[PDB]
Amino acid sequence: MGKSTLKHTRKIQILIDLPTKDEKKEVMDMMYQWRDRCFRAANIIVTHLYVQEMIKDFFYLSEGIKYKLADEKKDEKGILQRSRMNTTYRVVSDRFKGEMPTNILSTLNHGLISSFNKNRVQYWKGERSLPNFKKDMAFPFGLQGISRLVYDEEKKAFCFRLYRVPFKTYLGKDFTDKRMLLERLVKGDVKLCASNIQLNGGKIFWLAVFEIEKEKHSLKPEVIAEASLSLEYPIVVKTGKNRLTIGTKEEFLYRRLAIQAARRRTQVGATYSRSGKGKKRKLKAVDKYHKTESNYVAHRIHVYSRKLIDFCIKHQAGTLILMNQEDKVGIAKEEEFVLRNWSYYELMTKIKYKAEKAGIELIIG
Amino acid sequence: MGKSTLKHTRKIQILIDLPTKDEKKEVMDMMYQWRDRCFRAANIIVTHLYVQEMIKDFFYLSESRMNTTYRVVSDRFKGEMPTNILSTLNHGLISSFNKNRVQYWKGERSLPNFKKDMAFPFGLQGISRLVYDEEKKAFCFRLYRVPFKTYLGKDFTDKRMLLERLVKGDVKLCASNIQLNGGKIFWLAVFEIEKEKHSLKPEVIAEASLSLEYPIVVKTGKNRLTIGTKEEFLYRRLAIQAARRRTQVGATYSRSGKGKKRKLKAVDKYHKTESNYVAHRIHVYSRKLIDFCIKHQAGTLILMNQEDKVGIAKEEEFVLRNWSYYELMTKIKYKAEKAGIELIIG
DNA sequence: CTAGCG
DNA sequence: CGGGTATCCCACAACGCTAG
RNA sequence: GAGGGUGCUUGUACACCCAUAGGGUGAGGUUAAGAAUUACACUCACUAAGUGUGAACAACACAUACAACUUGUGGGAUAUACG
Numbered sequence: 001m002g003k004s005t006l007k008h009t010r011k012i013q014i015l016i017d018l019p020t021k022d023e024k025k026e027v028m029d030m031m032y033q034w035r036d037r038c039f040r041a042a043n044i045i046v047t048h049l050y051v052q053e054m055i056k057d058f059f060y061l062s063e064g065i066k067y068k069l070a071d072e073k074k075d076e077k078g079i080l081q082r083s084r085m086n087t088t089y090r091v092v093s094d095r096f097k098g099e100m101p102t103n104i105l106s107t108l109n110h111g112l113i114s115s116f117n118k119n120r121v122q123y124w125k126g127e128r129s130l131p132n133f134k135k136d137m138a139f140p141f142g143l144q145g146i147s148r149l150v151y152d153e154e155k156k157a158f159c160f161r162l163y164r165v166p167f168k169t170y171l172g173k174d175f176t177d178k179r180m181l182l183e184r185l186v187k188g189d190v191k192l193c194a195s196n197i198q199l200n201g202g203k204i205f206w207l208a209v210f211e212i213e214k215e216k217h218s219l220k221p222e223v224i225a226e227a228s229l230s231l232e233y234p235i236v237v238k239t240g241k242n243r244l245t246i247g248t249k250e251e252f253l254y255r256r257l258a259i260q261a262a263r264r265r266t267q268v269g270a271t272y273s274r275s276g277k278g279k280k281r282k283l284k285a286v287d288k289y290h291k292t293e294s295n296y297v298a299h300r301i302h303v304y305s306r307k308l309i310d311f312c313i314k315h316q317a318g319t320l321i322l323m324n325q326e327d328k329v330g331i332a333k334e335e336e337f338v339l340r341n342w343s344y345y346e347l348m349t350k351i352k353y354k355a356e357k358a359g360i361e362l363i364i365g
Numbered sequence: 366m367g368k369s370t371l372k373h374t375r376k377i378q379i380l381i382d383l384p385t386k387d388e389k390k391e392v393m394d395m396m397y398q399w400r401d402r403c404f405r406a407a408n409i410i411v412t413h414l415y416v417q418e419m420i421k422d423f424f425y426l427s428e429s430r431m432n433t434t435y436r437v438v439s440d441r442f443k444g445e446m447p448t449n450i451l452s453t454l455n456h457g458l459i460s461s462f463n464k465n466r467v468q469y470w471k472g473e474r475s476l477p478n479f480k481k482d483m484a485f486p487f488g489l490q491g492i493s494r495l496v497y498d499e500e501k502k503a504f505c506f507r508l509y510r511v512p513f514k515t516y517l518g519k520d521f522t523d524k525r526m527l528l529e530r531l532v533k534g535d536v537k538l539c540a541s542n543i544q545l546n547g548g549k550i551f552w553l554a555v556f557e558i559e560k561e562k563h564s565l566k567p568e569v570i571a572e573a574s575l576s577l578e579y580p581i582v583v584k585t586g587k588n589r590l591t592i593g594t595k596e597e598f599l600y601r602r603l604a605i606q607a608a609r610r611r612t613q614v615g616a617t618y619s620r621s622g623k624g625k626k627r628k629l630k631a632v633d634k635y636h637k638t639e640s641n642y643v644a645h646r647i648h649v650y651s652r653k654l655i656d657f658c659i660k661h662q663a664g665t666l667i668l669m670n671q672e673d674k675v676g677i678a679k680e681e682e683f684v685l686r687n688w689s690y691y692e693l694m695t696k697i698k699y700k701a702e703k704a705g706i707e708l709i710i711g
Numbered sequence: 712c713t714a715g716c717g
Numbered sequence: 718c719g720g721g722t723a724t725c726c727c728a729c730a731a732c733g734c735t736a737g
Numbered sequence: 738g739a740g741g742g743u744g745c746u747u748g749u750a751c752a753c754c755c756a757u758a759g760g761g762u763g764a765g766g767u768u769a770a771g772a773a774u775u776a777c778a779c780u781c782a783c784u785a786a787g788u789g790u791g792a793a794c795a796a797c798a799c800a801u802a803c804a805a806c807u808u809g810u811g812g813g814a815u816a817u818a819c820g
Contacts, residue, residue: 062437
């Protein structure tokens, strides 16, 4: 049987549940410590995974031995004293024990070794650099971190202990969207995957990864929906005599160009702002647009994707084909403006995963 | 007390100085083999040097410092790879590791690794017979027994002048690089140029003029530099003015009877800080003009009146007005006297 | 509840 | 041409069990 | 008046607020000058924001309509700004 669930990530805001300020500050300092140690750990993992492969390659070219990475107790030619994943986990645990819980490591190391194997051939060949994990990386954690999850009616918020630190859930005015999903996890009706935890300027965010089941619709795959993507009209869709124009040039392209105009306005004007105090202070004004472009284009892409899938659903268009997308990709790679200003990879992945969630099969021509 | 010599890097195109195309093809494929060898060797030195330093953390394997790696790579690619290049590369990698050891310890930065398309390093010994050829109308040299001819084309940039001073020896060359991008051979050279003491030459004429869309624009020979732009100087003006208007509106609707000073101190402060803002802006612009004069050894600076009558003027506000503004001229004169620049009112 | 191992 | 950085494309992941 | 704060996260307007926030500072290093002092797109850091109760810059409670809500990690790539 195939996977009946698709992964999803929700942003639930969680707040430290301690009565006083100094205890909250202690928790927050401990979590900044967790983030910093996790980033150091991830660097350590990728370096430690790069090193022994070069040891293998050096030995191979020196004396032609087919050395391999495995437990020597199970392989004659192996160079490692235990399983490789245990090697990286053990070295990182030894270097950083007693500061952050070891499940951050036991869930980070898996993610890094899984990706290193798939980038192995390119690291041997040489078109990729060793990842340089950033300091704002969210530290991942597993289900061993959630315990005693319950609904406390005194506070009307979900309460749990994330590694011996309590947390109430600040769902706010979300009594229908995620309030149900966590209730589904208290009593065992939804599955929670190993999640990530963000820290952004005094607010904690629990990027919970669930497994949302598909939605069985009244779809007729014989009905075919034709969509055309352009930087003049974002989405144009056909279904027999039914057509919906999704988005406008003014709303998407012209807004994005105005936003870039503001960013360039500010970059030009930053030269004569408060100087003599470092680069960060001068470029505070352009820090303001840290992620404004990405967020606006992201929301517009999401709205277009949802409107298109709703178009298919209301017409029961069980199969969607994106017309002539190969030609558009080809011509776009030659013109800088479209590639920079026509986010087609994000729109493509959004449409693919939404259509695969909703049961609409997507074919690209 | 920084280093008296500055380092500049130029990207120049270099061709094989050979008559037949087949010879060029062989030379270029041999250079590609060189690049592959340098890539593998560099990865080996970085990883193995990391291993040797971090040995105590490598317990999970089965059961000077330069020389071991140098001999290993020498037996690795002897004959197929100029050992001078390998020695330069090993020196570079060990130096970089020494510089970044502290960051390597803490887990701050992972191990920097190289690529298939890295430009291979070479010392001064690789380049031989660096002479400027008139018959071939370019610069020619022999990189590891291989003659090579340089291409500048219709290059009006500083590359030709740098090449002339280099072949004349006025500029020292440092550890360079050779890159193979898009079927083209390029030379990434690093030049050690002594910072000649800049002295004010009174013959240099610097013309300072105001404009309608640049706060200060200054001309000096073929070097052109503008200081600021109208929106930059006007943003803060509009911002403070809007703040003053809004604060006035709020105060008029605020609680009265507590004193007129408590009501209009915000307005007085906004006007005063506007004046201080223009003072600081003139200060920075004057500093930039002085730096422009210094950077081109301009001993004489003259500010053009450029007033005229009617024409295009008398309608536009001519941002920065005219040289009658908030002690602008007196400040340029003071800073020039501090720098010894000749100032003649024009 | 946390830490180990593949 | 310097880091640093705003975005684009493009790939991958988001464990599972046992024992003190 | 742009821009922001609170109103779960993102977008649009929204009521209450902050706003010279492209500002006000603080720390370290470097540099120039006889000094005051200046300068650094050097590095780092801090400081404003709904209403009520509350001595409180403690805490708790209440706090918009609409659309969206699969996000993180990494690499490759170009561009803008400045030197």
